[PDB]
Amino acid sequence: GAMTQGLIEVERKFAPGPDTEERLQELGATLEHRVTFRDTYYDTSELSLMLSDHWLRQREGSGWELKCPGVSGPHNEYVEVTSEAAIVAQLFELLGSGEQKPAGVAAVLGSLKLQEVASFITTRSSWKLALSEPQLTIDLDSADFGYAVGEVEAMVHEKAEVPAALEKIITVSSMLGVPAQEEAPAKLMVYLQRFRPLDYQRLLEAAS
Ligand SMILES: Cc1ncc(C[n+]2csc(CCOP(=O)(O)OP(=O)(O)O)c2C)c(N)n1
Ligand SMILES: [Mg+2]
Ligand SMILES: [Mg+2]
């Protein structure tokens, strides 16, 4: 037999500005693709998934994905699950349907009292940047509800490499975006804050 795993993705969000694309161009980045896609997130009425740092979505053209917290000191760690059967097992453990019998994620939604909590369309430009060695990716996202966020992404092999990669992408992010102390918010968090502010408040309360 054999075991297989992926690389580690390291990421940092930033607020783009009017000059972000021009900076990318002058740095020698190339625009690899432009794409538009719907994201739809799901949770229970009590926000069971989100309150425990679990994030379940169906992404147009990609299928189901679930993000779970992992056990970078100042920065978050996530395990991404895209196997439907592993998503469903994780959801059963957390939301406890002992009786529930497995199936595709879609089929188990009702049984788990999972409902759509947010849906929106993102228009994305994805750029690649080689410096002096593997190309960084820069995703520039525009959400149809009216919010723009960029993100710099690097891949690395071992967890030992994560701290240096983080510093690099933080520094690159700062040259591409508006000055800021903290990381720019995720599209979903801005959506929740503006359009589901009672839910946002629950999330705020939990984290402090
Ligand atoms: C302040 C804050 N930021 C981030 C998180 C974690 N989080 C919020 S929404 C989300 C899912 C959306 O992730 P995103 O990075 O926007 O996915 P993308 O659309 O870029 O693929 C996660 C993991 C949190 N709990 N609190
Ligand atoms: Mg990306
Ligand atoms: Mg990303």
Author numbering: -1 to 69, 73 to 133, 139 to 214
Please, what does the article write about this entry?
The Vtc4p β-tunnel domain is not unique to eukaryotic polyP polymerases but is a structural hallmark of triphosphate tunnel metalloenzymes (TTMs), whose characteristic features are the presence of a topologically closed hydrophilic β-barrel, the preference for triphosphate-containing substrates, and for a divalent metal co-factor (PFAM families CYTH and VTC). Our comparative analysis defines that most of these enzymes share a common catalytic mechanism in their tunnel centers, yet they have evolved different substrate recognition modes on their tunnel entries.
We thus structurally characterized a mammalian TTM ThTPase, which was previously shown to specifically hydrolyze thiamine triphosphate (ThTP) into ThDP and Pi. We next solved a crystal structure of mouse ThTPase in the presence of ThTP and Mg2+ in a second crystal form grown at pH 9.0, where substrate hydrolysis can occur. Indeed, we found a product complex trapped in the active site of the enzyme, with a ThDP molecule and an orthophosphate located in the tunnel center. The γ-phosphate in our structure apparently has been hydrolyzed, and the resulting Pi has slightly moved away from the tunnel center. It is now found coordinated by Arg-125 and in direct contact with a Mn2+ ion located in metal binding site 2, reinforcing the notion that this metal ion may play a crucial role in catalysis. The acidic patch in mouse ThTPase (corresponding to site 2 in AtTTM3 and ygiF) again allows for Mg2+ ion binding, as concluded from NMR titration experiments.
